[model samples]
Target: TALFTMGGNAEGQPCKFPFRFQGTSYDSCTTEGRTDGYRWCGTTEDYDRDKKYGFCPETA
Candidate 1:
């Protein structure tokens, strides 16, 4: 039930499960590169390739 944007360009895009990031697969939002402890997810199935991502909702 996660929503995402395409590199913050468009809105209301659903997060893709099992998305790839940094050679790892994620089924949900992650704080991988966030220093502020915020979560983000890929809008595409392969973020390593598409580079499409967005911040997760605060409630997530």
Candidate 2:
């Protein structure tokens, strides 16, 4: 499924894989750092460096 930014300038943009967040690296969607418990991914390979991210589409 396609990924989309939850908000901000990159909203609705595609997500980047193999991204890093809070020192952890993720190749797929993750629930880290989210209080809402939704899966999300970084907009860039290095989310900690770029501070950009996007949410993953819900699965059935």
Candidate 3:
């Protein structure tokens, strides 16, 4: 399975798949188009800044 792995916080807290910030949910944690193959944890100000996939018909 192509799962998205997450990194730890400044406090060493590890939670990748369900990565969140300030009690907010991220669509895909650190999914990238190149190396990491993932974007990032949050979307407020994207980290990896990956683009959204068009596999779904639902709009964000």
Candidate 4:
């Protein structure tokens, strides 16, 4: 687990340095997503704000 690595003081890439799921390293970062009428990205307005780190759900 990455958190456990804190004690080990091992070096790693920035992106992958602290990436994990359930204390386990997870590979792959590409995935297709399309929500139909489910309020994808929680986007309600036609425009968006804060280009950097945009809201994941876009809404709530």
lDDT score for candidate 4 against the true structure: 0.23
lDDT against the true structure, each candidate? 0.75, 0.74, 0.33, 0.23
After superposition on all C-alphas, the RMSD of every candidate to the true structure, in Å, is: 2.9, 2.4, 10.1, 15.9
Clashing pairs in 3: 30-38, 30-39, 30-40, 31-38, 31-39, 32-37, 32-38, 32-39
Each model's TM-score? Answer: 0.70, 0.72, 0.23, 0.18
Q: Rank by TM-score, highest first.
A: 2, 1, 3, 4
Deviation (Å) of 21 in candidate 3: 1.6
Q: Point out where model 3 deviates above 4 Å.
A: 1-15, 30-38, 42-60
Output candidate 3 Cα RMSD. Answer: 10.1
Ranked by TM-score, the better of candidates 1 and 3 is 1
Off by over 4 Å in 1: 6-12, 58-60
Q: Give per-residue lDDT, candidate 1, residue 10.
A: 27
Worst 10 residues of 2 by lDDT: 1-10
Where does candidate 2 clash, by residue pair?
A: none
Q: 14-35, model 1: which lDDT tens digit per residue?
A: 7777889998999877887778
**Model 1: residue 21 alpha-carbon error in angstroms:** 0.6
